[PDB]
Amino acid sequence: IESIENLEDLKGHSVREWVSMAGPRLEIHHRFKNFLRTHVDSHGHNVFKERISDMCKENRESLVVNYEDLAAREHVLAYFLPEAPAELLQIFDEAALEVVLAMYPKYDRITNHIHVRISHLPLVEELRSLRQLHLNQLIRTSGVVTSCTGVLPQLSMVKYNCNKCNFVLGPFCQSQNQEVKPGSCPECQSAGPFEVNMEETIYQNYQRIRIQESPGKVAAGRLPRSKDAILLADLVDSCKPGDEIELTGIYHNNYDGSLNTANGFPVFATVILANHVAKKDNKVAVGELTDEDVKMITSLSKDQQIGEKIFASIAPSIYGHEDIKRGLALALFGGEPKNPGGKHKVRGDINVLLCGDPGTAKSQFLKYIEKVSSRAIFTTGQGASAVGLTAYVQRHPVSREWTLEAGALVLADRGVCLIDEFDKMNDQDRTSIHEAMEQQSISISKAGIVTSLQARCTVIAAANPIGGRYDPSLTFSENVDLTEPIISRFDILCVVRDTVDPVQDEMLARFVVGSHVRHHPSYGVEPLPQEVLKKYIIYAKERVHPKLNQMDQDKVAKMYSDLRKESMATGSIPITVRHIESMIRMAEAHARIHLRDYVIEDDVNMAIRVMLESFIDTQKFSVMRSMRKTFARYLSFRRDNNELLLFILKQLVAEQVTYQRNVPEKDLVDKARQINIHNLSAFYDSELFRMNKFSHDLKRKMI
Amino acid sequence: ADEGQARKSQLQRRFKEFLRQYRVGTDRTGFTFKYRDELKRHYNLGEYWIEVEMEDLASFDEDLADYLYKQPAEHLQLLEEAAKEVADEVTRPRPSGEEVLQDIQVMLKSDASPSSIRSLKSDMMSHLVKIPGIIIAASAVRAKATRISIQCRSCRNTLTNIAMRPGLEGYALPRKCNTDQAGRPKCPLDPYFIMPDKCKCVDFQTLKLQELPDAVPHGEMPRHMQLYCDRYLCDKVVPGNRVTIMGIYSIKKFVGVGIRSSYIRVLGIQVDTGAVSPQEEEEFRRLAALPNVYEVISKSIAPSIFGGTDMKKAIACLLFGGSRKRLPDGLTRRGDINLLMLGDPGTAKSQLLKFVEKCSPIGVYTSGKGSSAAGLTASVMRDPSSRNFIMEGGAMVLADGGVVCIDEFDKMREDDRVAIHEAMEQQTISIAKAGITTTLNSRCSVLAAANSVFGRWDETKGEDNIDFMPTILSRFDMIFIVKDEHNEERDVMLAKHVITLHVSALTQTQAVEGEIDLAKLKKFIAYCRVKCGPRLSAEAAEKLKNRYIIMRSGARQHERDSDRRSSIPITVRQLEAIVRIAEALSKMKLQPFATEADVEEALRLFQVSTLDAA
DNA sequence: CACACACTCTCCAATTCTCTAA
DNA sequence: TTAGAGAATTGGAGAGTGTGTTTTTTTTTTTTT
Ligand SMILES: Nc1ncnc2c1ncn2[C@@H]1O[C@H](COP(=O)(O)OP(=O)(O)NP(=O)(O)O)[C@@H](O)[C@H]1O
Ligand SMILES: Nc1ncnc2c1ncn2[C@@H]1O[C@H](COP(=O)(O)OP(=O)(O)NP(=O)(O)O)[C@@H](O)[C@H]1O
Ligand SMILES: [Mg+2]
Ligand SMILES: [Mg+2]
């Protein structure tokens, strides 16, 4: 077969038969092999070497190709791909298998076929806009998955035992169109009750989903359109009911006598043969992270001011509210679940309650967390129910047996449940979340179903006080209207007030008007870009797991004991035992923010500060100052310790001068590791050595 | 061709030599022919089954083990036929009435790590798989034909002892009459019919295996897998059991076009955990015999929880239970103990429920908010397979013989709460709905957790802290009102305990002195429950009588002094509750009689509940 | 199961082609 | 030039094969009570 120098001249054919014949088929095969081997990104890095290597590391049998890259590098393949998608995807699968077995010669033991998936295809279509013009073409659509079958085995290459003799009928390919009837046995011509040879038959995973238009893209009072889609092989369980997805697939039609007799006209059934599923929720998975991305994340973690940067990156368009940003950062990164002895589970997720005045950006904080977090569920007040929050039982739509279904807390199982207008809920709806908040489970005993579902989510709620205005004359317990069991289930408990303060009002006004200028259609520390923050968050949550070695038990124990005393004194907030475990969770969350594999006293002091400041915030005006001096003098607001390193430096300089008269930074840091004062960067940024005329340089190491 | 039969003969011979030659032991100690001995003893007991270990088979001959893994259906019948041969030559001669050799069911187990239900993908069809899960449904046991004979309606031409393939696969009757000439009539289109008197049938059962709760991906519902059980695997498990299934992943063989329904043909069941080995048995005798068994049990209840010793002791009494009785006139007296924990938040009530559900031999946990009357007791519904009304058990039925842990007990609706009165006292559920009229058993303890009406107890409020009715409250043997006491040294010790508890999660889960592991205490509770039912001694009963009268007079005078009725009544059910607690304390020690010491301890525990009343 | 419809195949004989006489 | 006797082709009768069928109750959930 001679190489074909121009695929583009169809010479009167259509694309389907043109690429079906051998010459153009081999030319397409070689072009796709060369594309995979030689395509490089803007930095010159061979992207497909990395992608195939990751696929073979993880045994995933599927290779995502970016259509933008294909169109940029090899034009005619991008030209023919949407016109004859089945044929070219078959050729691409063959070529990808050749390249994969060139890279990893033993990968045939793991797979026998590589599925090339296409992403970022510009041929986006609305479900309501699909026409007969799109038939047998590669389309891209969006919608919410509303139904899913179980993963079912489907015949792909089926063999039949002959009904009389021992012969086996040849491989017949399943089509998605009709049942394959064997015909007659070529040995003996019998055509009786044939039966499938299960052992010699090749099966494939099958899953039929129904997607419909997303409820925010449909018009009000209008019914949504929907399509069936077939997921085959490793595309099964790419989505669940409720998932917003983008779906690339072949728009396929076949004759259906049922539709013909339903309509009275020869109407053909339609289905999408899915090629690529991408959840609009998970725009970036952990598998999508490249070596550049993880190198960026790990190098960025070494900044040593990263905690302030991460805190500042929480809702960068909101002035002030540094304590809110801190608490939301800790909740967003989260702690670690633990189960000592396999018999005592304790939650790792941190729950947050933002109570306070109108127009104080509580809802804006909640919508920011919704936007930034993967697996965010947002709900509001009366719009939620006990049943809808937790889980619900219904007659199955077609078969009519009772079936359990996932509520918001179950759907957010490794994510965030956001409850705006939390005080406006019904008590019966609000009490439903207790088990999910603490025990991280939802137990249902209804209509013959008796089971517990996992609801390991983090609850971030927003509320108003009684009368819609916080009263410093009263404590939090006196003006919230919530009760102790629900108040104690929130680890971080924030009060936001809108009191007059002219200088802060001027700065806030300038920030707000500057924001309106910046975002037109066209604290000090600087934040991360939000894309980088999302990548950092998912890496920190999935690839990093803090472990607590010690936390200086005496400090936290004494703190908890007298925090209990003052809570009993004022009645401002119940403290129970949950606040201790909140301390451990917040320490683990700060360690995760710093990407530490092990928790340290830096994290413990951060958690201590958060707890004490919020508890102080719950108090009245006069009581608040006395509480401030109480917990500040006696307990640990460990701001800095520069004096010890200062006189260690002075002592070392005095001894060195005395030695020389009659590498100092190495001497200093040696003493700083000998004594438990290891955070020396703070001393090097502080003024105490500077006005004493010392200085530092990481290269010269002289001071 | 017959070369396939030659292959079958040699493979059956190799399985026979495995079962004839396999030994365990060492030359220093001695050898025992494991599978010969098991075959002999089971056949003489009339059991006609054995369980073979895949690792033993692989050590003997790895090719046979590989063949069983890859092609279990083909080679398991050869293994079973070899087992039948070995059974014959191991048991011959047999007495009269046992001359006819029986078929042997060969079950399989392995030490291999199991796969998940979601690991079962199309590459593994017809292969041998091992998966865990929970039995959530189990059908009635029914008959599956293993051998049939079919007779032709015209000529009475008969085919005899047709082998029926195991599993949910059926059989195709021949399309045209076999082996005789095409005469007149040639054939009516179904010439054959199954002869009624010649069929050989075996028991079979259908079960639903649910995915384990900790195996489910985040946000997804647990998956279901159908299980086909056969012969002695029928009724080996019930709903609520945790199992490791060994079986053949297969399609049924008599939404989409080429879609086939899959199931697992079970070849072995390992209940994860009706029998105690003698070593466990004598160790349980020892454990009951030692003098501080009550304290050891109480320290074993929820060891990660600081304090609450009286509550743990009452929970131990609830776990062991009293003794159920039927009196000469046919009336039944409840044996189970009902316990309510009521009060302040963050006091480990939910942790105690989560411990008891895991420690009890039979135990179910449910939230009061998430439950209903039908879902707790029993529900009535129509079946899509046959339009008739059937019953489905609720929490009480599923926990019959054990404990229902009702968390959030104050949150359930009152109309749903009145459903469990009969199941709490009479231990029965009388249903009369949709024509079906019956009375099911619900012999289970209720361990309930609840909060105050005002969250905390708020001690000035008194009786207004309780919205429960006297009817439901009188059905609880003990009502522990739990108050979170703010004491400084208590708080320091509790905080250090919690911090150490969180710190120690990485310590490789080492054994501990002076307490019973949960897996052992579960078995011990089951053993004591099935073995020992105590009674009161006479003098002990006299002590209980007099103390009860004193307590009743005190309760009456307290209510009279208050001029208001207390929410907790002191009734004859509370007398019988004290009796049940004393019997549970004796049952911990396996003593046939309850002593004055047991009655005194029961009264001590009950006087916490009487403190909670007065 | 069993009694009507729906469909194919085969054989039989009736019509038309070819060659001859009236 | 008509038409009639013998041979070959086409019409359709009928024998044979295969397919399809015979309001009710309990429970949930949201909204309205
Ligand atoms: N500190 C702030 N910085 C920037 N914008 C702010 C700030 N405080 C309030 N806003 C703006 O105020 C508007 C209202 O915010 P919103 O989150 O709805 O208030 P809220 O906390 O939800 N009050 P409420 O809904 O009655 O509970 C938004 O446009 C915010 O951007
Ligand atoms: N004495 C204790 N020892 C150890 N952990 C404790 C103790 N008391 C409370 N806790 C912890 O507190 C948390 C809440 O426990 P939980 O079982 O929900 O108590 P509760 O009384 O049921 N709370 P609530 O449902 O609001 O009434 C868990 O993480 C427990 O481990
Ligand atoms: Mg708001
Ligand atoms: Mg609780």
Ligand SMILES: [Zn+2]
């Ligand atoms: Zn054949």
Ligand SMILES: [Zn+2]
């Ligand atoms: Zn016959």
